[PDB]
Design an enzyme around this catalytic site. Structure first.
Site, PDB file in Angstrom:
ATOM      1  N   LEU A   1       8.891  51.006  -0.651  1.00  0.00           N
ATOM      2  CA  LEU A   1      10.036  50.568   0.132  1.00  0.00           C
ATOM      3  C   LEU A   1      11.118  50.109  -0.845  1.00  0.00           C
ATOM      4  O   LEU A   1      10.806  49.570  -1.908  1.00  0.00           O
ATOM      5  CB  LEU A   1       9.641  49.404   1.049  1.00  0.00           C
TER       6      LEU A   1
ATOM      7  N   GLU B   1      10.984  41.496   8.411  1.00  0.00           N
ATOM      8  CA  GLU B   1      10.876  42.869   8.898  1.00  0.00           C
ATOM      9  C   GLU B   1       9.411  43.324   8.964  1.00  0.00           C
ATOM     10  O   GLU B   1       9.031  44.087   9.863  1.00  0.00           O
ATOM     11  CB  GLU B   1      11.704  43.823   8.032  1.00  0.00           C
TER      12      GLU B   1
HETATM   13  N1  LIG Z   1      10.541  52.128   5.751  1.00  0.00           N
HETATM   14  C1  LIG Z   1       9.633  52.695   6.549  1.00  0.00           C
HETATM   15  O1  LIG Z   1       9.643  52.495   7.943  1.00  0.00           O
HETATM   16  C2  LIG Z   1       8.575  53.569   5.946  1.00  0.00           C
HETATM   17  C3  LIG Z   1       8.788  54.170   4.713  1.00  0.00           C
HETATM   18  N2  LIG Z   1       7.812  54.930   4.131  1.00  0.00           N
HETATM   19  C4  LIG Z   1       8.091  55.538   2.821  1.00  0.00           C
HETATM   20  O2  LIG Z   1       7.988  56.950   2.845  1.00  0.00           O
HETATM   21  C5  LIG Z   1       7.546  57.430   1.588  1.00  0.00           C
HETATM   22  C6  LIG Z   1       6.333  58.329   1.800  1.00  0.00           C
HETATM   23  O3  LIG Z   1       6.607  59.351   2.748  1.00  0.00           O
HETATM   24  P1  LIG Z   1       6.331  60.882   2.321  1.00  0.00           P
HETATM   25  O4  LIG Z   1       6.544  60.942   0.859  1.00  0.00           O
HETATM   26  O5  LIG Z   1       7.065  61.802   3.219  1.00  0.00           O
HETATM   27  O6  LIG Z   1       4.756  61.096   2.592  1.00  0.00           O
HETATM   28  P2  LIG Z   1       3.881  61.052   3.945  1.00  0.00           P
HETATM   29  O7  LIG Z   1       3.443  59.668   4.226  1.00  0.00           O
HETATM   30  O8  LIG Z   1       4.635  61.642   5.074  1.00  0.00           O
HETATM   31  O9  LIG Z   1       2.621  61.987   3.619  1.00  0.00           O
HETATM   32  C7  LIG Z   1       2.758  63.386   3.623  1.00  0.00           C
HETATM   33  C8  LIG Z   1       1.356  63.964   3.568  1.00  0.00           C
HETATM   34  O10 LIG Z   1       0.744  63.901   4.844  1.00  0.00           O
HETATM   35  C9  LIG Z   1      -0.054  65.054   5.061  1.00  0.00           C
HETATM   36  N3  LIG Z   1       0.467  65.833   6.203  1.00  0.00           N
HETATM   37  C10 LIG Z   1       1.783  66.072   6.504  1.00  0.00           C
HETATM   38  N4  LIG Z   1       1.841  66.797   7.648  1.00  0.00           N
HETATM   39  C11 LIG Z   1       0.582  67.009   8.096  1.00  0.00           C
HETATM   40  C12 LIG Z   1       0.064  67.676   9.210  1.00  0.00           C
HETATM   41  N5  LIG Z   1       0.863  68.264  10.092  1.00  0.00           N
HETATM   42  N6  LIG Z   1      -1.302  67.723   9.405  1.00  0.00           N
HETATM   43  C13 LIG Z   1      -2.147  67.114   8.503  1.00  0.00           C
HETATM   44  N7  LIG Z   1      -1.624  66.452   7.407  1.00  0.00           N
HETATM   45  C14 LIG Z   1      -0.287  66.400   7.199  1.00  0.00           C
HETATM   46  C15 LIG Z   1      -0.023  65.835   3.762  1.00  0.00           C
HETATM   47  O11 LIG Z   1      -1.041  65.248   2.990  1.00  0.00           O
HETATM   48  P3  LIG Z   1      -1.857  66.037   1.853  1.00  0.00           P
HETATM   49  O12 LIG Z   1      -0.894  66.349   0.729  1.00  0.00           O
HETATM   50  O13 LIG Z   1      -2.961  65.149   1.334  1.00  0.00           O
HETATM   51  O14 LIG Z   1      -2.456  67.299   2.432  1.00  0.00           O
HETATM   52  C16 LIG Z   1       1.303  65.426   3.167  1.00  0.00           C
HETATM   53  O15 LIG Z   1       1.301  65.570   1.767  1.00  0.00           O
HETATM   54  C17 LIG Z   1       7.212  56.201   0.745  1.00  0.00           C
HETATM   55  O16 LIG Z   1       8.303  55.928  -0.108  1.00  0.00           O
HETATM   56  C18 LIG Z   1       7.110  55.078   1.761  1.00  0.00           C
HETATM   57  O17 LIG Z   1       7.478  53.820   1.228  1.00  0.00           O
HETATM   58  C19 LIG Z   1       6.605  55.113   4.750  1.00  0.00           C
HETATM   59  C20 LIG Z   1       6.365  54.519   5.987  1.00  0.00           C
HETATM   60  C21 LIG Z   1       7.356  53.744   6.589  1.00  0.00           C
HETATM   61  C1  LIG Z   2       7.239  46.627   7.217  1.00  0.00           C
HETATM   62  C2  LIG Z   2       7.535  48.083   6.881  1.00  0.00           C
HETATM   63  C3  LIG Z   2       7.743  48.928   8.146  1.00  0.00           C
HETATM   64  N1  LIG Z   2       8.734  48.518   9.058  1.00  0.00           N
HETATM   65  C4  LIG Z   2       8.983  49.254  10.222  1.00  0.00           C
HETATM   66  N2  LIG Z   2       9.915  48.854  11.076  1.00  0.00           N
HETATM   67  N3  LIG Z   2       8.242  50.406  10.486  1.00  0.00           N
HETATM   68  C5  LIG Z   2       7.255  50.821   9.582  1.00  0.00           C
HETATM   69  N4  LIG Z   2       6.550  51.922   9.835  1.00  0.00           N
HETATM   70  C6  LIG Z   2       7.013  50.082   8.427  1.00  0.00           C
HETATM   71  C7  LIG Z   2       6.003  50.507   7.507  1.00  0.00           C
HETATM   72  C8  LIG Z   2       5.138  50.866   6.721  1.00  0.00           C
HETATM   73  C9  LIG Z   2       4.112  51.317   5.776  1.00  0.00           C
HETATM   74  C10 LIG Z   2       2.819  51.637   6.525  1.00  0.00           C
HETATM   75  C11 LIG Z   2       3.878  50.246   4.704  1.00  0.00           C
HETATM   76  C12 LIG Z   2       4.331  50.479   3.406  1.00  0.00           C
HETATM   77  C13 LIG Z   2       4.143  49.523   2.405  1.00  0.00           C
HETATM   78  O1  LIG Z   2       4.582  49.750   1.124  1.00  0.00           O
HETATM   79  C14 LIG Z   2       5.250  51.027   0.989  1.00  0.00           C
HETATM   80  C15 LIG Z   2       3.488  48.328   2.712  1.00  0.00           C
HETATM   81  C16 LIG Z   2       3.032  48.087   4.010  1.00  0.00           C
HETATM   82  C17 LIG Z   2       2.374  46.894   4.310  1.00  0.00           C
HETATM   83  C18 LIG Z   2       2.478  45.791   3.463  1.00  0.00           C
HETATM   84  C19 LIG Z   2       1.815  44.613   3.799  1.00  0.00           C
HETATM   85  N5  LIG Z   2       1.083  44.539   4.907  1.00  0.00           N
HETATM   86  C20 LIG Z   2       0.959  45.575   5.733  1.00  0.00           C
HETATM   87  C21 LIG Z   2       1.596  46.784   5.461  1.00  0.00           C
HETATM   88  C22 LIG Z   2       3.239  49.043   5.009  1.00  0.00           C
END
Ligand SMILES: NC(=O)C1=CN([C@@H]2O[C@H](COP(=O)(O)OP(=O)(O)OC[C@H]3O[C@@H](n4cnc5c(N)ncnc54)[C@H](OP(=O)(O)O)[C@@H]3O)[C@@H](O)[C@H]2O)C=CC1
Ligand SMILES: CCc1nc(N)nc(N)c1C#C[C@H](C)c1cc(OC)cc(-c2ccncc2)c1
Length: 225
Positions: free
Chosen positions: A23, A30
């Site tokens: 992140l 948040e």
């Molecule tokens: N701010 C937020 O609300 C959030 C932000 N993030 C951020 O996003 C970033 C990571 O996202 P990203 O890099 O896109 O990676 P993902 O978390 O989306 O993972 C992608 C992987 O999921 C698997 N996959 C994708 N599609 C399918 C499918 N249709 N069926 C089965 N498996 C599938 C594959 O795994 P494999 O390669 O093993 O086959 C692919 O490599 C991080 O920087 C994280 O911090 C993440 C969550 C929340």
């Molecule tokens: C709030 C962040 C967050 N906010 C909102 N509004 N939606 C989401 N989907 C996520 C999210 C997320 C992913 C799963 C995540 C990433 C991470 O680092 C990339 C740390 C945590 C995490 C650290 C501490 N405790 C529980 C979860 C969760």
């Protein structure tokens, strides 16, 4: 039969969600909202499902994974079946689509899943646009004196606005009862676009929790057997 909801925190205006596998920020308030929404349910005998890409799973600190009180589902092209238990609280699936079909079966889940949350992955979020019924989005803005953080992953804002509409007027109604927030629904203009939701401020950031819902559809065909 069970609602599919995507949940995410994004920095306006480009909706950056992550940088270098993490992140771009660290905001206690948040994380608090995210934990409570995904965890809490209206029916005490049900739990929510959290589905995430494999890369999002590896970004969560080992101390906090799997996420407590929620059914965890990690999807990877390298797993076996369409849905299978691998450990306590952890399911592995090789298909996001078939995974959802399986979860929807009332024989399998015996109607004990309240909601299905898609909690992460830019790659996962892109495939959820057709799948999800709703979207919970935290819109973030750096304050005047704050530096904008660097980012390399983004939510697809375009697809979002073709299929969904800003339903924030229903955010409070949509969340589980037990949750309480420290703001009032507010509309604020920021860099041209309208930001509507519940306001918060931590560090050098201003942010809003919001809700998106699928648009109405025309009736073109119903399958007759
Ligand atoms: N701010 C937020 O609300 C959030 C932000 N993030 C951020 O996003 C970033 C990571 O996202 P990203 O890099 O896109 O990676 P993902 O978390 O989306 O993972 C992608 C992987 O999921 C698997 N996959 C994708 N599609 C399918 C499918 N249709 N069926 C089965 N498996 C599938 C594959 O795994 P494999 O390669 O093993 O086959 C692919 O490599 C991080 O920087 C994280 O911090 C993440 C969550 C929340
Ligand atoms: C709030 C962040 C967050 N906010 C909102 N509004 N939606 C989401 N989907 C996520 C999210 C997320 C992913 C799963 C995540 C990433 C991470 O680092 C990339 C740390 C945590 C995490 C650290 C501490 N405790 C529980 C979860 C969760």
């Amino acid at each position: 039969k069970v609602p599919v909801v995507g949940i995410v925190a994004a920095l306006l205006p480009e909706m950056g969600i992550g940088f270098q596998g993490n992140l771009p920020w660290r905001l206690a308030k948040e994380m608090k909202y995210f934990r409570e929404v995904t965890t809490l349910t209206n029916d005490n005998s049900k739990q929510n499902v959290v589905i995430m890409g494999r890369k999002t799973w590896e970004s969560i600190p080992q101390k906090f994974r799997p996420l407590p009180k929620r059914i965890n589902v990690v999807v990877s092209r390298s797993f076996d079946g369409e849905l299978r238990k691998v450990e306590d609280g952890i399911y592995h699936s090789n298909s996001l689509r078939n995974c959802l079909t399986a979860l929807q079966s009332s024989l399998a889940n015996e109607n004990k899943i309240e909601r299905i949350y898609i909690i992460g992955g830019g790659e996962i979020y892109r495939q959820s646009m057709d799948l999800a019924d709703h979207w919970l989005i935290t819109k973030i803005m750096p304050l005047p004196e704050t530096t904008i953080p660097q980012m390399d992953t983004f939510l697809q804002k375009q697809e979002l606005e073709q299929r969904f509409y800003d339903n924030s007027d229903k955010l409070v109604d949509f969340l589980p009862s037990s949750i309480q927030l420290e703001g009032r629904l507010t509309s604020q203009e920021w860099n041209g676009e309208l930001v509507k939701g519940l306001p918060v401020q931590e560090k050098g950031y201003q942010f809003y929790f919001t809700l998106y819902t699928k648009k109405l559809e025309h009736h073109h065909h119903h399958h007759h057997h």
